[PDB]
Design a protein around this ligand. Structure first.
Ligand SMILES: O=P(O)(O)O[C@H]1[C@@H](OP(=O)(O)O)[C@@H](OP(=O)(O)O)[C@@H](OP(=O)(O)O)[C@@H](OP(=O)(O)O)[C@@H]1OP(=O)(O)O
Ligand SMILES: O=P(O)(O)O[C@H]1[C@@H](OP(=O)(O)O)[C@@H](OP(=O)(O)O)[C@@H](OP(=O)(O)O)[C@@H](OP(=O)(O)O)[C@@H]1OP(=O)(O)O
Lengths: 235, 234, 235, 234
């Protein structure tokens, strides 16, 4: 089994320097370009996705749409799950980062961001940046939908989908492509490579560059992961 | 029940004067502008799709992705089927429309183009323009895939999908959207409105402008189909 | 690819000499033994279905349950379609088979029964033996559901499902098992073996005996089909 | 939203005094009569399941088939999942309950039987009573498949399936039926009503009697649950 992870490029809120989380934000004109290059890299490097897996957040869906259109594989099957979404930023969704830093000071700020298990305070259910009762999640248990998260909490809800659903295609000899987000992807990678809780903060997965994993019958790396553009990734 | 039909905008072969059919040709820069106009019409005119259905051809898949991006509904479930594909053009796929009109003459040219029962000649299986063995059809009974088609044949392979798959969603209370091709879409309209075998040749579906059908429980129009741009429709 | 066909044993109506059709009649007590017998036959000859398809008619669903029980493959995926159903017997549904011979006469009786393309008279909509409005067909285009059917009509409706859905498991290397009826199963064997409209009336598929086919990449037979009990099948 | 839970009855191992768990043991002649009574109970008390969910252990599947046969809804769509499976007993699987009590003693025996979070010793992978590699689970991440469990662990792996899959049908207005096991069914009950980690051991779900739940938008009980045979459940 071969798996391919693709992290989306920058969003319209990344540009405005706002915390995103689950807020459905569009890809910036810049991020739309990294997607094309991700697709160009798939075709070029001869990595051919048999099935596609995305989150319910537009930016990642778009990235897949663009990338698969340069790769000549727009036709492949597509499943979307909330469990592949980004780490919900809680109360911090739609709040200036630079302003957050001032109001919270450098320690607390860094915790909420590069901390493994400390979630931002939860967001108010009535806030303009609350996706509580959002149409795209109406067939899911309302009680499982988070109002704030941490990388650890992201991994918890991601695994069940991976184990059941994604594993199915991998174990069926299908090359799976996941177009996800920063937290959810490092989450998948922490699990796969057995990275401990402390060391995960050090992992960075760049944007618009496919990460490829070749797994054994037990879904454990047969060899070390590799990007289709090592140069661009090490920079 | 509610149904939205969207004919993909222009393609890369509209300027080449080549009969396309099943060849997986892409949208042009103009096709893409049209896709986004469809999406804007969906949002502007308040038509909110719950589920999406596309053919296995990139030009409609591209149109769907673009329109939905504009309508903020990029998240909805998406299913694809070859039974929504364009009318296969047999040996005519990849050939100059104007050169072909000089070889077969006007009458034969119109029959190959707008006849209900008469299909083009079977394409050679080794022709560089044959979709035989195409990976995107490798989990389909090989013996059913066409080598030429007519609107009659198209309608035949399209109905089973509409009958089981698409109707389940309409009878489940969903607003279904179909991003397809001109022939297959006219094929469906014929079925829905009971258009005669003689009268169907003259119907035309505007590219990039959504046709909405308000169906009853028997999947029959409860009122006449309306385009989201009625003035531009006709 | 390996396909396995299992024709269900007699119903309670077959017992009372009545034309069944789409009427949801239950398997008779002999039919239950014929079912069990069928399962004990899949296990013995080493035919292991990875997936199962059935009709919406309880008599065939029931045949699979019992057969798969004795076979130890109760866990496999199960999909069911009206397209795999028996031929809708029209007005003849719920009528004594012997009173129909007297009422119509030989040629016409042998017509509505063994003809390839001439279907029985359509059954009245308010008749008790009418499947119109039936809950198990409520998510299917109302307009496609028959009110009478011929063998020709049956293959036309059955073929789409076999081409799209069933063909997917075969082509995926999975061993398929289909629990259907007389007409639907023969209509499919006709398709497979190229039997002409003329020579089809002549073919009979014995009940409770698994007919296995060894197909190739084009879904066309490699070697001649064979029952698991050649003697009882030829009896 | 209406959910009906059904516990499967007597297995071939009730007379054997053996730890079952994930071994694929089948019903006994009585187990089958209890499944018929459940079916007759469904039909009689007018509760019509629109769709079915079951574990991957034969004893519950049989129950479901027999039950639906009597109820007349044999046709309904059926879904299966390892996440509805019984609690795994680990090394104890296939071992005599009495000989086990001699090896560990009362306290440690009750702990392995009635506690909420102290699971049994991990079953060796080369034990003939180990479900490792069984075909029914070949398309599941090998890593997540248990080598022993507790009710606490059952609830952790069961939940994801309920949340995404089962609740989908529930939130779609369908009447759902789960034919599972004692641990898995009680596991779901502890979650549905808010039963404490220590009060759950005091909950007993009767074999063969369908337990109905009338839920609300949040999948929390609107009114208290009710068996289709109140007197028999007590
Ligand atoms: O002129 P447009 O409205 O843009 O549509 C045309 C046209 O379709 P209609 O005539 O049905 O509207 C062509 O059909 P013919 O006139 O040649 O019959 C069709 O060419 P094909 O016959 O090859 O389909 C061609 O499509 P293409 O450019 O792919 O050849 C193109 O449609 P598009 O605007 O979608 O490209
Ligand atoms: O005593 P019963 O009502 O007949 O039910 C028992 C019982 O289950 P409950 O205690 O949950 O009712 C056993 O459990 P213990 O009392 O011994 O803890 C269980 O044995 P396991 O320990 O192996 O689960 C056994 O099942 P089996 O006969 O398969 O061993 C059986 O349940 P069934 O009546 O459903 O078989």
């Amino acid at each position: 089994p071969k798996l391919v992870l693709v992290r989306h490029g920058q969003s319209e809120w990344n540009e405005k320097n706002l915390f995103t989380g689950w807020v459905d934000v569009k890809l910036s004109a810049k991020g739309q370009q990294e997607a094309a290059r991700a697709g160009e890299l798939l075709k070029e490097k001869k990595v051919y996705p048999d099935v596609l897996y995305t989150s319910k957040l537009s930016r990642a869906i778009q990235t897949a749409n663009i990338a698969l259109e340069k790769a000549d594989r727009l036709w492949i099957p597509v499943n979307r799950s909330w469990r592949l979404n980004e780490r919900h930023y809680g109360d911090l969704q739609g709040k200036d980062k630079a302003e957050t830093l001032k109001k919270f000071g450098e320690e607390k700020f860094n915790t909420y961001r590069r901390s493994f298990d400390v979630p931002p305070p939860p967001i108010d259910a009535s806030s303009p940046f609350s996706q509580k009762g959002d149409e795209r999640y109406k067939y899911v248990d309302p009680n499982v939908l988070p109002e704030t998260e941490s990388l650890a909490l992201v991994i918890d809800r991601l695994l069940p989908y991976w184990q059941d659903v994604i594993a199915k295609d991998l174990l069926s000899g299908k090359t799976v492509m996941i177009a996800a987000h920063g937290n959810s992807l490092r989450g998948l990678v922490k699990h796969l490579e057995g990275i401990s809780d402390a060391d995960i903060a050090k992992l960075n997965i760049p944007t618009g560059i496919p990460l490829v994993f070749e797994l054994d019958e037990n879904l454990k790396p047969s060899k070390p992961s590799y990007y289709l553009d090592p140069e661009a990734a090490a920079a």
